[PDB]
Amino acid sequence: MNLQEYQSKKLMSDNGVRVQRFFVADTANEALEAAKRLNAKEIVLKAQILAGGRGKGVFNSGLKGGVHLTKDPNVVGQLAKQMIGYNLATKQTPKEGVKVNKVMVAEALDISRETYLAILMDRSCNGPVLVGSPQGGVDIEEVAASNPELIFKEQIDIFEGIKDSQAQRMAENLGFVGPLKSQAADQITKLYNLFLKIDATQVEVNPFGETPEGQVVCFDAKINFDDNAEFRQKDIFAMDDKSENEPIENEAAKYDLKYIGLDGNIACFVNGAGLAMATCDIIFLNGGKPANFLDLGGGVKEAQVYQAFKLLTADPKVEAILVNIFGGIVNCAIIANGITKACRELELKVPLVVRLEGTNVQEAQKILNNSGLPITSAIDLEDAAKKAVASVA
Amino acid sequence: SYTASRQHLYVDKNTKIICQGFTGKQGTFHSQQALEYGTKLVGGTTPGKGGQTHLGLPVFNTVKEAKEQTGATASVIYVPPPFAAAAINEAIEAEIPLVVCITEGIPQQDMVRVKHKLLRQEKTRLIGPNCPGVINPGECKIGIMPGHIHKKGRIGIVSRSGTLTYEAVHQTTQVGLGQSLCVGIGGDPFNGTDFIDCLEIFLNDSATEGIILIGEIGGNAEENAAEFLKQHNSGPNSKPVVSFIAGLTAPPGRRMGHAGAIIAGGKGGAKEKISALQSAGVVVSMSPAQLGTTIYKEFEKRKMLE
Numbered sequence A: 001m002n003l004q005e006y007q008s009k010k011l012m013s014d015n016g017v018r019v020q021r022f023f024v025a026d027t028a029n030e031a032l033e034a035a036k037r038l039n040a041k042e043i044v045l046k047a048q049i050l051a052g053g054r055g056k057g058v059f060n061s062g063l064k065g066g067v068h069l070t071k072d073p074n075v076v077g078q079l080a081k082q083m084i085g086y087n088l089a090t091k092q093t094p095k096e097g098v099k100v101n102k103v104m105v106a107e108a109l110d111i112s113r114e115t116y117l118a119i120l121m122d123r124s125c126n127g128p129v130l131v132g133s134p135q136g137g138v139d140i141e142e143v144a145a146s147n148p149e150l151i152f153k154e155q156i157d158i159f160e161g162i163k164d165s166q167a168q169r170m171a172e173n174l175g176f177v178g179p180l181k182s183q184a185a186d187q188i189t190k191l192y193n194l195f196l197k198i199d200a201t202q203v204e205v206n207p208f209g210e211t212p213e214g215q216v217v218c219f220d221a222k223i224n225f226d227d228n229a230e231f232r233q234k235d236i237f238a239m240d241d242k243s244e245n246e247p248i249e250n251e252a253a254k255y256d257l258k259y260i261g262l263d264g265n266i267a268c269f270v271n272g273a274g275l276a277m278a279t280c281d282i283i284f285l286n287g288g289k290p291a292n293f294l295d296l297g298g299g300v301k302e303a304q305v306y307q308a309f310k311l312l313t314a315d316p317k318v319e320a321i322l323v324n325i326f327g328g329i330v331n332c333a334i335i336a337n338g339i340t341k342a343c344r345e346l347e348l349k350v351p352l353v354v355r356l357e358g359t360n361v362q363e364a365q366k367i368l369n370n371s372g373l374p375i376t377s378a379i380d381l382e383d384a385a386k387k388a389v390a391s392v393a
Numbered sequence B: 001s002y003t004a005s006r007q008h009l010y011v012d013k014n015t016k017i018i019c020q021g022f023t024g025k026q027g028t029f030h031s032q033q034a035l036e037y038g039t040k041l042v043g044g045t046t047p048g049k050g051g052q053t054h055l056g057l058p059v060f061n062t063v064k065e066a067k068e069q070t071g072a073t074a075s076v077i078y079v080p081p082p083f084a085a086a087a088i089n090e091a092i093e094a095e096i097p098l099v100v101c102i103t104e105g106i107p108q109q110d111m112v113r114v115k116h117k118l119l120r121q122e123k124t125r126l127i128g129p130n131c132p133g134v135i136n137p138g139e140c141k142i143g144i145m146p147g148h149i150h151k152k153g154r155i156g157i158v159s160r161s162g163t164l165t166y167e168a169v170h171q172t173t174q175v176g177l178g179q180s181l182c183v184g185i186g187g188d189p190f191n192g193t194d195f196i197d198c199l200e201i202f203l204n205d206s207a208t209e210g211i212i213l214i215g216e217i218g219g220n221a222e223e224n225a226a227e228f229l230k231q232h233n234s235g236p237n238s239k240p241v242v243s244f245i246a247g248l249t250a251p252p253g254r255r256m257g258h259a260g261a262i263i264a265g266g267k268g269g270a271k272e273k274i275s276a277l278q279s280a281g282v283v284v285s286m287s288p289a290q291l292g293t294t295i296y297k298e299f300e301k302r303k304m305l306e
Ligand SMILES: CC(C)(COP(=O)(O)OP(=O)(O)OC[C@H]1O[C@@H](n2cnc3c(N)ncnc32)[C@H](O)[C@@H]1OP(=O)(O)O)[C@@H](O)C(=O)NCCC(=O)NCCSC(=O)[C@H](O)[C@@H](O)C(=O)O
Pocket: A271, A272, A273, A274, A275, A297, A298, A299, B020, B021, B022, B023, B024, B025, B026, B027, B045, B046, B047, B077, B078, B079, B080, B081, B083, B086, B087, B102, B103, B104, B105, B130, B131, B132, B144, B160, B161, B162, B163, B164, B184, B187
C-alpha cells in the first residue's frame, strides 16, 4: 500500500515527528484559504500524486510543474485552480497522467543540512535497526557503493526499546551538533516508536535535516507497511490509494491473490509462491518473456483457478498461459474439468499449457485434450515452458 | 544457545505430535489426513475446548496440559495470524522440543518478538512460520506435504518453498535416490530455522549423503549458508550440495507472494545468491526442472551409486 505525501506527513506529525506546516485542499478556494492560514514567508503548492517527477510534470490544463513556490496566497489559489481536477503527467506516469484531487499547501522551509535516516527490521540481527548517513539527499544505495564508511547502524532490542544512548550516538554520526544533536536524537526516538506503532517494514527519512532557523525536520519520507498487519492497521490501510496501481493487480487483491505484472506476453500461475517465481524464471530460461507472477497459495481451490483465468483473459498483452498445479489429494480430473469450465465461460482466446501433478493425471490430460479448446498438457516444468514459448509468434 | 536445539529438527518414528488449532478447519483436515496416514498425532489444543474429543483424540486447553497428558514431543500450529505468535510462545514456554508453524500472515513485528524469546532458550526448536513442515520419509510427517511422493533415501532437502521441494522430491525419487530428511523453513523473513541450522544436521547425519538447498530472493540466508559451507564442507568428507534459487526474473521492490521474497534497497537478488553458493562448491541448477539430474550426476562423479 502507498500513502500520499500529505497522508504520511500527517501520520508522522500525529506521532510527534517534526514536519513542515501544511494543509490539504480539494478546491482552489480552499487552497487560497489554507495559504492565508499558514502566515508563512514562503508557501509551496504541491499536487498530490504517488508517482515521482511532479516538479517537471505537466497538467492537461497546460500548466507546467506540479510544485510551485510563492509568497502570495492569491497565487496559490490561482495555480491550484489549474491543478485540481486535471491530470498530472510525469516521466513516471502513463502519458494520460494521474487525476489530481488534492493539493498540499505548506510552509516552504530552507534546508541547511541533509542526512539519511531509516528504520527497518534487520534480517540478520533479528530486531529493529537504525540506518543513517550524513550524506543525505541521495540514493542510500549509492552512498553504500561510493562511501560504505558513511553508513552507520544501531541495532535495537525490541523489548528494551530505543535507548537515549543509541539515539544520541546516531544523531552525532549523522553530523548534528549542539542542541540540534539533542533535537535529532528526540526525533529518532519518535520515528522509532512510530515505526513500531504502525507495523511499518521501513520508515525512511530523506532528507532528515536542519533549517537555517535551527530546527531538525523530516523534510520528506517514505513509509512501507507490513501487509500481514492490515488486520490491526485498518485505519492506515483505509487510506491506501490504489488509483495508480495496475488494475489487474487491484482486481487480484480483491480475491486474496498475489499478482505482479511483468513486461512479457506469456502469463502463468501456480499454487505456491516458490514455484510461481520459478515458473516465471523457467519461461525466461527457455527463451520467453513472462507476463506476470501469480501465486494462488498452497493447496487447491478451484475458485482461485477460476479467478486467475478471469484476471489473465483480461490482459491484452497475454499471448499464452502456462498453468502449473499440484493437486495434492484433489483428483486432477476435477481440476481439469474446472479448467475447461473456466476457459469456456471466460472465453479463453490464447493457447494454454497445463502441467498437473497428483492423482488421476492421465484422465485429466484426456479431459483437456477432448475439450475442443486450445489447451495442451505438459509432462514437466521444462516441457511446459518450451511448449508455452513455442505457442507465441 | 538456541543452536543446541537444531537436533530436534530430525523427527523420527518416536515423535508424538499435538495440533494447536486442532478443531479448526485446516487443523481438522490435516489431522484427518495425518491419522489416515498413520502419523502419531496424539491430541491437540483449542483454548476453551479442553475435555472435548476430536477425531477420536483428546482436546486440551493448554499446551502444558496436552504435553503432560500425552508426552508429546512436537506441535504443529494451524492458528490464525492474530494469535499464532501467542501459540508459538505458548509452545516455547511449555518446552515442546519441536514446533512447526504452518500459519501464513503473522505480522513481521510479532515474529521479531517471538525470535527474541526463541533465541534466549534452547528447549524448543521452531520451524516456520509460513512453512509446509518437516518429513523423515516413512518415519514421521509433520505438516501439509504429500507423503506418497517421498521415499526414504540419501538426500537432505532444505527449502524456503514447499512447491519447489515437491519438484526436488519427485525428481530425486524418479532417479532412485530418495530423501533422508526434508525441512521446509518457509517463506517469511523472520523465522525459527535457517539454512545453516539444517546444513549442520545434514553434514553430521550419516544417512544424508548429499544435499539440496532451495532458496529464493530476499534476505541473506543463502549467502550465510555459502559461508558456512566454505568453512565446514570444503575439505575431507565433504558432501555434494545442489541448489536452485528462485526469482531471477523478479522485479525490485515487490513481495513475490512470500513475505520474505523481496529485493529491497538493492539487496536480495537471485544472481548474488547463485554466485555466493557457486563459490562455496554448490552446483546451482539454473532450472528448477533439473535438481534431480544435477544431484544424480554429482553422486556419479563421486562414485556414490550402485
Ligand atoms: C490455516 C490457518 C492458520 C487457519 O485457518 P483455518 O483453519 O481456516 O481457521 P479456523 O478459524 O477454522 O481455525 C483456527 C482455530 O484455531 C483456534 N485457536 C485460536 N487461538 C488458538 C491458540 N492460541 N491455540 C490453539 N488454537 C487456537 C481457533 O479457536 C480455531 O478453532 P475453533 O474454530 O475455535 O474450533 C490460516 O490462517 C492460514 O495460515 N492459512 C494458510 C496456510 C498456508 O498456506 N501456509 C503456508 C504453507 S507452505 C506453502 O503454502 C508452500 O510452501 C508455498 O509457500 C510454496 O512456496 O509453495
